[PDB]
Amino acid sequence: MKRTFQPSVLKRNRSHGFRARMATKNGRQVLARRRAKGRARLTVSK
Amino acid sequence: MIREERLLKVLRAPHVSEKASTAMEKSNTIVLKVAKDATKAEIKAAVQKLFEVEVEVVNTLVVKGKVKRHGQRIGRRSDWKKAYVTLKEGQNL
Amino acid sequence: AVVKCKPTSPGRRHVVKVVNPELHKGKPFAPLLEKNSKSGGRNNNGRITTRHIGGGHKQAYRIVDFKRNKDGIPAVVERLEYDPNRSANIALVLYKDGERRYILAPKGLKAGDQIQSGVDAAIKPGNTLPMRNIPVGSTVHNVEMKPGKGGQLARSAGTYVQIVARDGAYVTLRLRSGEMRKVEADCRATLGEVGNAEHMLRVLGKAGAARWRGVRPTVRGTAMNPVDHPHGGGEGRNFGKHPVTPWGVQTKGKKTRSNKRTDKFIVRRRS
RNA sequence: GCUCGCCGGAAGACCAAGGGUUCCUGUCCAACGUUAAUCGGGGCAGGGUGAGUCGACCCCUAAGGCGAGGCCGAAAGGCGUAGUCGAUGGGAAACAGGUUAAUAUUCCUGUACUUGGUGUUACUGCGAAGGGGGGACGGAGAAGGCUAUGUUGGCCGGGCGACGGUUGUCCCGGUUUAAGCGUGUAGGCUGGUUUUCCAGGCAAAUCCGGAAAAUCAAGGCUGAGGCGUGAUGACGAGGCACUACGGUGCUGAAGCAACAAAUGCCCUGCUUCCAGGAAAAGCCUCUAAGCAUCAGGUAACAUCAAAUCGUACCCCAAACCGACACAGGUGGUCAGGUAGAGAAUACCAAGGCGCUUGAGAGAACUCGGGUGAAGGAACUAGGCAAAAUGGUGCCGUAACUUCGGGAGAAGGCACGCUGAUAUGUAGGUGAGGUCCCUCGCGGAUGGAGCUGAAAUCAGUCGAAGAUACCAGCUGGCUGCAACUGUUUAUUAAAAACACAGCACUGUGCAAACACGAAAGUGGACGUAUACGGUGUGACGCCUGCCCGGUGCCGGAAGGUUAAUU
RNA sequence: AGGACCGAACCGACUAAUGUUGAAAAAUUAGCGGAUGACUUGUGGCUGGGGGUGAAAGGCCAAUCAAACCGGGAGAUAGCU
Ligand SMILES: [Mg+2]
Ligand SMILES: [Mg+2]
Ligand SMILES: [Mg+2]
Ligand SMILES: [Mg+2]
Ligand SMILES: [Mg+2]
Ligand SMILES: [Mg+2]
Ligand SMILES: [Mg+2]
Ligand SMILES: [Mg+2]
Ligand SMILES: [Mg+2]
Ligand SMILES: [Mg+2]
Ligand SMILES: [Mg+2]
Ligand SMILES: [Mg+2]
Ligand SMILES: [Mg+2]
Ligand SMILES: [Mg+2]
Ligand SMILES: [Mg+2]
Ligand SMILES: [Mg+2]
Ligand SMILES: [Mg+2]
Ligand SMILES: [Mg+2]
Ligand SMILES: [Mg+2]
Ligand SMILES: [Mg+2]
Ligand SMILES: [Mg+2]
Ligand SMILES: [Mg+2]
Ligand SMILES: [Mg+2]
Ligand SMILES: [Mg+2]
Ligand SMILES: [Mg+2]
Ligand SMILES: [Mg+2]
Ligand SMILES: [Mg+2]
Ligand SMILES: [Mg+2]
Ligand SMILES: [Mg+2]
Ligand SMILES: [Mg+2]
Ligand SMILES: [Mg+2]
Ligand SMILES: [Mg+2]
Ligand SMILES: [Mg+2]
Ligand SMILES: [Mg+2]
Ligand SMILES: [Mg+2]
Ligand SMILES: [Mg+2]
Ligand SMILES: [Mg+2]
Ligand SMILES: [Mg+2]
Ligand SMILES: [Mg+2]
Ligand SMILES: [Mg+2]
Ligand SMILES: [Mg+2]
Ligand SMILES: [Mg+2]
Ligand SMILES: [Mg+2]
Ligand SMILES: [Mg+2]
Ligand SMILES: [Mg+2]
Ligand SMILES: [Mg+2]
Ligand SMILES: [Mg+2]
Ligand SMILES: [Mg+2]
Ligand SMILES: [Mg+2]
Ligand SMILES: [Mg+2]
Ligand SMILES: [Mg+2]
Ligand SMILES: [Mg+2]
Ligand SMILES: [Mg+2]
């Protein structure tokens, strides 16, 4: 049966990537929280 | 025209392998490790200057580095650039 | 002409078609075309604002001349054409100077007929004049509401206005609704009725024919649950409330016009 | 290695997406692999991806996003103009053969093509952010011409058979060749050519559009395939020589014709319909400012350049999405033979596999199947399940009907093989020859060869000839819903929802209405034959009485009544 | 011509049996419906939580829905176990 995760790297990047995060105040707050927590990977970008 | 300082950095090493050995004997082609950012024009210039040969054409490719376990920790070797440099017929490097 | 389809399948049995052999079979005049992509009834917030709009055939927009302000230059009708964007047909006209335009096709207009606009045009169908220069009692269409703005009234297939009176700067019009309205006498109108009056005899015949025209299905309020609509609810067919819109306003008689700015121009409401 | 079995519109082959070394080689077997394992998509090491023409990048836009100023908003921000991004679409150009353990339209061999920069020569009105053309567009249908491809004959090479026969109307194999260049064919579309004038194309225009004359009868554009050339080449059944028996070295005959034939190509065509079918650039063309013997444009020649990134491998799967080496899911491309209407079905080809626990035994019971005396729904809530029907042609077919239907109603007959009609028919195709020719990829006649149904007569075998696989059970009365559709992803598919149709009602355009503190946007580039809401639900015959209650509409005298004073 | 007819691909899900610590957190096998259309499918886009979207089942909105998920108010409150 068709499951929920149907991967597309273009959609991944556009939805959750570094530039999408940076485009809004709320996205920049995500990055701030993740930096503060000390995450090795800030975003899905790769 | 490329500066000699640039040309002295672009060629890194000769590449040794059976494919490289056959390339030399059959097609008069040397195989080189080159700087990642080296262009075909820079490779041609550097080979002609530093090895004192006449170059017909340069083909290039990027080799992606292998992922490898050292003990338990995962590591990844660096990518590098390889050049197939075809020499003119009677050059004999 | 109005033709009844033979019942060779249940979806054809009730179809009635309006077939006009005068209409151009070929493609439209390409210099007067533009794209018009569809909305689904969704505004710039992305939300549905008008229900029941979606799909249907793709359509090119034909630029129709509602202003008719190229005065003093005769034009000849080249052909009548189908326009998907409206009920009326349109007519491609060629002005003597070499310009082509589309206009609304009046009743009676055919290829080869001559038309003209301006103060000194003849009182003939398809000619456009200021309503100061049009006799009282005349039937007109494509009537301007403000001088120079272009026709806004009586554009649909088979429609027309009557000039019932002239009083100084204004004429009184009887509209198709039955409303009596004042309009400035400087406003232009085109003589005659809009053509294609058989449009209203068509019978779509089947559900899919409304889908081709980009209408999606209406679900009745009473078929819904209370959270969805005031009429929603009930064990079986129940109602027991005053009919309302989905947003709770009475929908059987309650008047909704509220425009004190334009009230002065309305001589008599449609009633 | 020899047998056997399975797929073969896939269980073969090639991609995209997604993964990311799983690819190839050597080595190891602890763990991983539902067992063992010398094996592995496992561990360890080493190798492997070659591009002017493929793809991305690049140029161009769609939906949509972001948006200088702007408009709007307690703040955050919202919307949007100029713009700028955004492919799933438009935009230059390469083919065949060879080669590695692992890449190849990328390497080599052979033969091509494209764009741009320079420079030479000859001619020359060049120039855009502007104008025009083009690009540039739907569904369905029909037929013709072709090709891919296949079958047969010929030809060449090989064979003479483990058991009766097999020098022949015998058996096996091969019989391949591109882009480009030339030719402009079947066919499609369009009347040309020249002058004069002009309220049009934001200004100009020699361009487009319009008007008017003269003149000519063919002028132009598009176009599959064929043929020539590419190609005295390559490839080649096989044969010969080595072998480090893994695979190399040497040499190579024939290489044609007919017939059949696509869902591919001509075809973005042609016919027809209504629901009326992107944009922008590249491309062609006209001029403005301006340059004005300069720059710049056109043609021929030479030369240089064409970067960068991807290219391994899996890809209906043990490599992707499903915690698994998981009976699930996953877009595109290719499409051999016999039989068949067929991409169904059976059996095979090329190619690929036997599904990573086995060995015995032959109890009950369970699962999936086969057959069954006599009876034949007696079973059961219920013929649930099973059994049955099942093709083609012809004959024949009721109530009722909205005249279409009902209808495949029901029911019945024929059906194999051989011979004859006719040593292979009707039909299809059409060589040679002959005649003409506004002369060629031409027209007429001609019929060789090839292909080939269907029918009738006669015979003949079997229990059975639509023999297998494949493939309607039928009829009668009745409730509900007109109908095709839609629905509770994962216990409800229905009488529920929708529907065409009907009615009431609101709405005069800065429309009602909806989204939004607003600006705005949808409604609609629509305008009462239009748009919104509500109910009813094809069609036929109809749709009675009540305005007291609750609502809505109209009224404006009087009573009562807010802020305010 | 056709929301025409028979029937594969393709889309669906009417019946039954199996399975129910499954091969599978919804399938398999044999039958079944649509199959030129209100059809089906690839890529990209838009609509957001009292909100969307809904041919309307309170359906669907990442194995979650009569108010999603994540963090926070937060050690909510619990005459109850
Ligand atoms: Mg090269
Ligand atoms: Mg419309
Ligand atoms: Mg309705
Ligand atoms: Mg309900
Ligand atoms: Mg309510
Ligand atoms: Mg009741
Ligand atoms: Mg009651
Ligand atoms: Mg088989
Ligand atoms: Mg099959
Ligand atoms: Mg590894
Ligand atoms: Mg391997
Ligand atoms: Mg062991
Ligand atoms: Mg083991
Ligand atoms: Mg390994
Ligand atoms: Mg490359
Ligand atoms: Mg934009
Ligand atoms: Mg700003
Ligand atoms: Mg914006
Ligand atoms: Mg762009
Ligand atoms: Mg693309
Ligand atoms: Mg390979
Ligand atoms: Mg052929
Ligand atoms: Mg087809
Ligand atoms: Mg590959
Ligand atoms: Mg397994
Ligand atoms: Mg699997
Ligand atoms: Mg047994
Ligand atoms: Mg049994
Ligand atoms: Mg049986
Ligand atoms: Mg029995
Ligand atoms: Mg018996
Ligand atoms: Mg009986
Ligand atoms: Mg009984
Ligand atoms: Mg009983
Ligand atoms: Mg049954
Ligand atoms: Mg059965
Ligand atoms: Mg009853
Ligand atoms: Mg029904
Ligand atoms: Mg469904
Ligand atoms: Mg269900
Ligand atoms: Mg508006
Ligand atoms: Mg109803
Ligand atoms: Mg049908
Ligand atoms: Mg049916
Ligand atoms: Mg599928
Ligand atoms: Mg069900
Ligand atoms: Mg099934
Ligand atoms: Mg069917
Ligand atoms: Mg309920
Ligand atoms: Mg869910
Ligand atoms: Mg709540
Ligand atoms: Mg608290
Ligand atoms: Mg607590």
Phi, psi for residue C247 in degrees, rounded to 5: -100, 10
Range C22-28, long-range pairs (CB < 8 A, 24+ positions)? C22/C80, C22/C110, C22/C111, C23/C80, C23/C81, C23/C82, C23/C89, C24/C79, C24/C80, C24/C81, C24/C82, C24/C92, C28/C60, C28/C62, C28/C81
Phi, psi for residue B68 in degrees, rounded to 5: -145, 140
Half-sphere exposure of B84 (CA within 13 A, CB side): 15
Rounded to an integer, what distance in angstroms lies between the CA atom of residue C120 and that of residue C53?
A: 45
User: How many whole angstroms from its chain centre is CA C200?
Assistant: 12
Give the CATH number of the domain where residue B81 resides: 3.30.70.330
Residues 52-111 of C with CB under 7 A from strand D: 52-53, 56-61, 63-64, 72-74, 81-82, 84-88, 94-100
Rounded to an integer, what distance in angstroms lies between the CA atom of residue B15 and that of residue B84?
A: 10
DSSP assignments along C67-114, one per residue: S---TT--EEEEEEE--TTSSS-EEEEEETTS-EEEEE-BTT--TT-E
Give residue for tokens 């129709």.
Answer: C64
Which H or E run contains B69?
A: strand B67-70
Distance of CA A26 to CAs A29, A31, A45, C29, C197, Å? 5, 9, 18, 51, 58
Protein residues near ligand 6, an ion, with CB under 5 A: C 236
* CB of C45 nearer than 7 A to strand E: yes
> Domain residues for B14?
2-93
Instruction: Take residue C178 and report the two structure tokens written for it.
Output: 């039955």
Give chain B's domain count. Answer: 1
C238 C-alpha to ligand 7 centroid (Å)? 8
Contact by Cβ (8 Å): C151, C66: yes
Q: Which partners does chain A have (≥3 C-beta pairs < 8 Å)?
A: none
| Nearest alpha-carbon partner for C239 in C219, C255, C254, C224 | C224
C57 C-alpha to ligand 23 centroid (Å)? 24
Contact by Cβ (8 Å): B10, B34: yes
* CB of C30 nearer than 7 A to strand E: no
Resolution (Å units): 2.5
> Domain residues for A13?
1-46
| Nearest alpha-carbon partner for C189 in C241, C123, C247 | C123
Residues 166-205 of C with CB under 7 A from strand D: 175-177, 179, 181, 196-200, 202-205
Rounded to an integer, what distance in angstroms lies between the CA atom of residue C20 and that of residue C12?
A: 20
* CB of A19 nearer than 7 A to strand E: no
User: What letters, b where the CB count within 10 A reaches 16 and e where it falls short, cover C52-86?
Assistant: ebbeeeeeeebebbbbbebeeeebebebbbebeee
Spatial CB neighbours of C95, under 8 Å, sequence gap ≥ 6: C70, C73, C74, C75, C101
User: How many whole angstroms from its chain centre is CA A21?
Assistant: 7
A41 C-alpha to ligand 8 centroid (Å)? 54
Which H or E run contains B86?
A: strand B80-87
Query: In 3-state terms, chain A is what percent helix, strand and coil (to 5)?
Result: 55, 0, 45
Residues 73-102 of C with CB under 7 A from strand E: none
User: What letters, b where the CB count within 10 A reaches 16 and e where it falls short, cover C147-179?
Assistant: eeeebebbbbbbbbbbbeeeeeebbbbbbeeee
Rounded to an integer, what distance in angstroms lies between the CA atom of residue C176 and that of residue C36?
A: 29
CA–C1' gap, C118 and D445, in angstroms:
74
The dihedral built from the CA positions of residue C113, C115, C120 and C122, taken in this order, carries a sign that is positive
Q: What homologous superfamily is domain C1-113 in, according to CATH?
A: Nucleic acid-binding proteins (2.40.50.140)
Q: Coil, helix or strand for C181? A: strand
Q: Taking the CA atoms of chain B, what radius of gyration do you get in angstroms?
A: 15
Q: Where are the beta strands (DSSP E) in chain C?
A: 2-4, 16-18, 33-35, 60-62, 75-81, 90-95, 100-104, 114-115, 128-130, 139-141, 143-144, 151-153, 161-167, 170-174, 180-184, 188-191, 266-268
Strands B67-70 and C2-4: unpaired
B52: left (phi over 0), alpha (psi -120 to 50) or beta: left
Contact by Cβ (8 Å): A28, A4: no
Rounded to an integer, what distance in angstroms lies between the CA atom of residue B35 and that of residue B9?
A: 7
Give the type of residue at B70: H
Contact by Cβ (8 Å): C108, C148: no
Contact by Cβ (8 Å): B35, B16: no
Rounded to an integer, what distance in angstroms lies between the CA atom of residue C67 and that of residue C145?
A: 11
* CB of A14 nearer than 7 A to strand E: yes
Which fold is adopted by the domain C195-271? Ribosomal protein L2; domain 3 (4.10.950)
User: How many whole angstroms from its chain centre is CA C167?
Assistant: 28
Q: Which bases on strand E have an atom closer than 7 Å to a protein beta carbon?
A: 1-4, 24, 26-27, 37-39, 43-48, 52-58, 62-63, 67
Give the CATH number of the domain where residue A34 resides: 1.10.287.3980
Q: Which partners does chain B have (≥3 C-beta pairs < 8 Å)?
A: none
The dihedral built from the CA positions of residue C18, C23, C24 and C25, taken in this order, carries a sign that is positive
* CB of C17 nearer than 7 A to strand E: no
* CATH 4.10.950.10 placement within chain C: 195-271
* CB of A33 nearer than 7 A to strand E: no
Give chain A's domain count. Answer: 1
Rounded to an integer, what distance in angstroms lies between the CA atom of residue C257 and that of residue C254?
A: 10
The dihedral built from the CA positions of residue C241, C246, C251 and C255, taken in this order, carries a sign that is positive
Half-sphere exposure of B8 (CA within 13 A, CB side): 3
* CB of C209 nearer than 7 A to strand D: yes
Contact by Cβ (8 Å): B44, B88: no
DSSP assignments along B39-67, one per residue: -HHHHHHHHHHHS---EEEEEEEEEPPPE
* CB of C212 nearer than 7 A to strand D: yes
* CB of C129 nearer than 7 A to strand D: no
